[PDB]
């Protein structure tokens, strides 16, 4: 079979944006196998070795001012530039979540499920309300799930002791809509 | 923090695998097909609003390989430690009988970036309709990957996402069947 050892090398240039494009931080990192060896943090302004394996590079690269200049100005020519290139279909991408409420196939007490799927961006807020007032306890989330296709999904449960007439509401706030989406369960 | 765009690339010996891609908040914007030497967008639409000179990625890949050889040498040829993937199978949306849906096989937190994935419908391999993504980066420097299988839910059918990776002592079969 195949038992030969593998040797991996990764290079990652991460552009971190804060408040639109107000503050930008470029983080250039080299990873040998599963270990970062050298990096360039725009906040630092020069290459710094992360492990001894990376010392030669940090030292050699910093000795080249031309290289340093390009890297320092990359927060503009690279980061800010690429941000603008795809802002319309990324930063501004919005797909409304599909929301439904049904009791779980498990569970006295009744476990309610608020399924929220196919939405984008990932930042989202879903809360449960019993008769118009936030439910703090009992709530349990599956967490935010990234589907890999510019889509997210999540399930937020609410254990309850239902009484005829109660109205359990699942509320979902998302950038795709101005006012919050609400789906009600009538006990 | 608000947004993160990542240009992630790697070269792997001795599989001589190479990859070059852009990431936006965890979602792939595009990767370069090393063979056809062209940009392949994650969603057809992106290609109508932006472009990338794919050929340029290859120049970076050449340098990456040489750098790998250099690092391989100064580490005294220290091979990478295999790390087995976590595998999860979920649906694209709440499942309902005979209502078109999609099985997502999440292959997460693993390295090196080489994996064999196969979908199984009642013990047999499925090809029609399936798609997959390239290897995606992780903060811990391991990888994530998605495989997809469009399907027609039924009570009978039992699926499996069969995953092979050097970190696994044996093929991992993640079972999925209608339970609603």
């Amino acid at each position: 079979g195949d038992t030969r050892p593998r040797f991996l090398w990764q290079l990652k240039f991460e552009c971190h944006f804060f408040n639109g494009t107000e503050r930008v931080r470029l983080l250039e990192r080299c990873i040998y196998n599963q270990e970062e060896s050298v990096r360039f943090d725009s906040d630092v302004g020069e290459y710094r070795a992360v492990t001894e394996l990376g010392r030669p590079d940090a030292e050699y690269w910093n000795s080249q001012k031309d290289l340093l200049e390009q890297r320092r100005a990359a927060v503009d020519t690279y980061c800010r530039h690429n941000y603008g290139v795809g802002e319309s279909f990324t930063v501004q991408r919005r797909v409304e979540p599909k929301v439904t409420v049904y009791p779980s196939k498990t569970q006295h007490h009744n476990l309610l499920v608020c399924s929220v799927s196919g939405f984008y961006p990932g930042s989202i807020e879903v809360r449960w309300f019993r008769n118009g007032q936030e439910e703090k306890a009992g709530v349990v989330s599956t967490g935010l799930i990234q589907n890999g296709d510019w889509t997210f999904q999540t399930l937020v449960m609410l254990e309850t002791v239902p009484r005829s007439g109660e109205v359990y509401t699942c509320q979902v706030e998302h950038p795709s809509v101005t006012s919050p989406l609400t789906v009600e369960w009538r006990a | 923090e608000e947004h993160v765009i990542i240009q992630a690339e790697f070269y792997l010996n001795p599989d001589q695998s190479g990859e070059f891609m852009f990431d936006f908040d965890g979602d792939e914007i595009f990767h370069v097909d090393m063979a056809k030497k062209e940009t392949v967008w994650r969603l057809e639409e992106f290609g109508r609003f932006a472009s990338f000179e794919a050929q340029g990625a290859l120049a970076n890949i050449a340098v990456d390989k040489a750098n790998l050889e250099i690092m391989t040498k100064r580490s005294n040829y220290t091979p990478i430690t295999n790390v087995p993937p976590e595998v999860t199978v979920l649906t694209n949306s709440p499942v309902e009988l005979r209502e078109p849906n999609v099985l997502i096989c999440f292959i997460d937190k693993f390295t090196p970036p080489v994996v064999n994935v196969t979908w199984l419908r009642n013990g047999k391999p499925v090809t029609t309709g399936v798609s997959e993504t390239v290897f995606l980066p992780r903060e811990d420097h391991l990888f994530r990957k998605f495989h997809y299988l469009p399907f027609l839910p039924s009570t009978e059918d039992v699926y499996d996402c069969r995953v092979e990776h050097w970190g696994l002592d044996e093929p991992l079969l993640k079972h999925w069947e209608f339970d609603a």
Partner: peptide
């Protein structure tokens, strides 16, 4: 609009 890439630097020899 065109996406631009950061070039990979050669390691110290």
């Amino acid at each position: 609009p065109k996406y631009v890439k950061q070039n990979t630097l050669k390691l110290a020899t």
